[PDB]
Amino acid sequence: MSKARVYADVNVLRPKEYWDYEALTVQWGEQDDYEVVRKVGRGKYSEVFEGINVNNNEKCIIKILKPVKKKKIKREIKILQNLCGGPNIVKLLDIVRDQHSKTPSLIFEYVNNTDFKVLYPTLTDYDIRYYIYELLKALDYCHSQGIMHRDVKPHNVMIDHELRKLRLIDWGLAEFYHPGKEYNVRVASRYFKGPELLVDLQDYDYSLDMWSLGCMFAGMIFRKEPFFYGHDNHDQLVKIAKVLGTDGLNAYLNKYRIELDPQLEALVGRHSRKPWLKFMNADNQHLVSPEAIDFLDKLLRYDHQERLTALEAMTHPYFQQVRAAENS
Ligand SMILES: N#Cc1cnn2c(Nc3ccccc3)nc(NCc3ccc(Cl)cc3)nc12
Numbered sequence: 001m002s003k004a005r006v007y008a009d010v011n012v013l014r015p016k017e018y019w020d021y022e023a024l025t026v027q028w029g030e031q032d033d034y035e036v037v038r039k040v041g042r043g044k045y046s047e048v049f050e051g052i053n054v055n056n057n058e059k060c061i062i063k064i065l066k067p068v069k070k071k072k073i074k075r076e077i078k079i080l081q082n083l084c085g086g087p088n089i090v091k092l093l094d095i096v097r098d099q100h101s102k103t104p105s106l107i108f109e110y111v112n113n114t115d116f117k118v119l120y121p122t123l124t125d126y127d128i129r130y131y132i133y134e135l136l137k138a139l140d141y142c143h144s145q146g147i148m149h150r151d152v153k154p155h156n157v158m159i160d161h162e163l164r165k166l167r168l169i170d171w172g173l174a175e176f177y178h179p180g181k182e183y184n185v186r187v188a189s190r191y192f193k194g195p196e197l198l199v200d201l202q203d204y205d206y207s208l209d210m211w212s213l214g215c216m217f218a219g220m221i222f223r224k225e226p227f228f229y230g231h232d233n234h235d236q237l238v239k240i241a242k243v244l245g246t247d248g249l250n251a252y253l254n255k256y257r258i259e260l261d262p263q264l265e266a267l268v269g270r271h272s273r274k275p276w277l278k279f280m281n282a283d284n285q286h287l288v289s290p291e292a293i294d295f296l297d298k299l300l301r302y303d304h305q306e307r308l309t310a311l312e313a314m315t316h317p318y319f320q321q322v323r324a325a326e327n328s
Contacts, residue, residue, distance in 0.1 A: 002256065003179050004205035006309050010146030011176050019146065019176040021078035022071060029094035034062055034107055045172060050110065053093075059110035060093060064103060073104065076172045079147055083171075086145070088138040090158070090169040108169065114161050116154035120220055125287050126321070128220045131159065131166055133314065133322045135213065138168040140310035143206040149174050150187040152212035154219075177205055188212060190236050191226035195249070195302045198237040199258050207304035210313070214299030221292050223284040234264050244302060245273030252302035291318040 011019045041048035051062040080092035094107035151173040158167045182202040194211030196204040218227040230236030276293045295318040298308045
């Protein structure tokens with residue numbers, strides 16, 4: 001059995017109105033209020049367009065959803081509403097649907113994002129600490145509100161580099177945390193899936209997002225996209241084991257009485273732990289200081305219970321200049 005070490009009782013103490021999302025009655029806005037200006041992305045669940053609010057002429061993001069279950073859509077909407085106004089949490093502006101096709105569209109605030117594939121390589125040491133700190137704010141906030149994002153990755157972190165503004169988006173996989181509840185491990189994107197998901201540990205918690213954040217952090221300071229590059233869920237665990245080592249994995253599995261599928265256990269094999277500095281090179285030298293390594297080490301732990309919480313991460317000395325700057 002496993003439970004979160006913080007914010008475990010948030011949804012226990014709050015009224016059903018807060019977490020009983022299936023009771024939500026969607027209030028639709030007016031589709032004609034928003035017009036498409038250009039497509040900016042696509043995905044398995046939606047088509048994304050930069051749009052504009054014809055009323056106030058303000059930019060927005062229109063996500064036209066592909067067929068989705070009433071249950072799933074209400075969950076994303078309820079969570080967005082609960083987190084409204086939180087630090088760096090994307091704002092849901094409106095919800096509309098096309099009467100004839102019944103196609104729903106979610107309207108979000110616009111963020112002039114620079115593809116991480118091009119942005120990250122230009123980030124300085126300070127930029128990295130700054131943006132990761134900002135992302136942490138959003139995570140501690142949602143976790144403090146009894147919610148797990150479950151899909152933290154560069155594609156879901158919008159950044160207007162010019163304005164140094166960051167927003168954590170796409171809460172379609174997020175879930176409310178309930179002590180002891182068994183969740184579906186089929187969440188997050190492969191390169192950012194934590195060990196718990198890869199070994200089928202279902203009673204995971206907020207800590208899952210901290211592994212994901214760590215993967216992003218490792219990618220930034222080591223200049224690797226992504227850091228753990230696996231081809232399928234089994235290979236993903238292998239790539240991880242080849243870094244943290246199998247000793248740590250076995251200890252993890254024995255602590256939670258988990259048995260790897262024979263094939264998987266066969267693929268992982270046996271590996272030694274590799275020091276983080278073995279990934280340093282002339283390209284990521286100006287970014288891999290001892291503080292960065294110490295912080296990364298405390299995030300990428302097999303045991304989700306050992307990882308820093310978002311609040312702890314924000315206080316790590318690695319971020320001291322970012323904190324000092326803010327309190328000005
Ligand atoms: N909610 C919300 C949300 C807010 N902004 N936003 C943006 N902004 C944007 C603006 C200009 C160019 C590209 C994106 N894109 C996407 N989704 C599309 C997308 C495109 C590229 C990448 Cl890398 C990630 C996401 N979702 C959102």
